[PDB]
């Protein structure tokens, strides 16, 4: 593009347009918890020791 720079000319709008623009944002994760003693040992009593 080429803005025609002028020492004494100005461009002024004669008309306008309304617009609607979507903006999308994340706010939270899935709340999670882990029973580590079951995850590690699977109800092996000796692993639990």
């Amino acid at each position: 593009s080429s803005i025609a720079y002028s020492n004494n000319t100005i461009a002024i709008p004669t008309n306008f347009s309304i617009s609607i623009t979507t903006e999308v944002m994340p706010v939270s994760m899935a709340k999670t918890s882990v029973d580590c003693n079951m995850y590690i040992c699977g109800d092996s009593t000796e692993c639990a020791n």
Binding site: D35, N37, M38, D43
Partner: protein, 48 residues
């Protein structure tokens, strides 16, 4: 302790009983002839 909700333990249900399953069993051994055939051999006729 102050007002709130607190984590204290992981609970876990223990089993009430035990189950064993094996195949639909068949083919018994021919042992009954060795013990209770009708008149046993001599030490020379000796069934094995």
């Amino acid at each position: 302790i102050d007002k709130g909700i607190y984590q204290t333990s992981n609970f876990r249900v223990v089993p009430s009983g035990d189950v064993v399953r094996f195949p639909n069993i068949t083919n018994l051994c021919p042992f009954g002839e060795v013990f209770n055939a009708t008149k046993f051999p001599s030490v020379y006729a000796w069934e094995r």
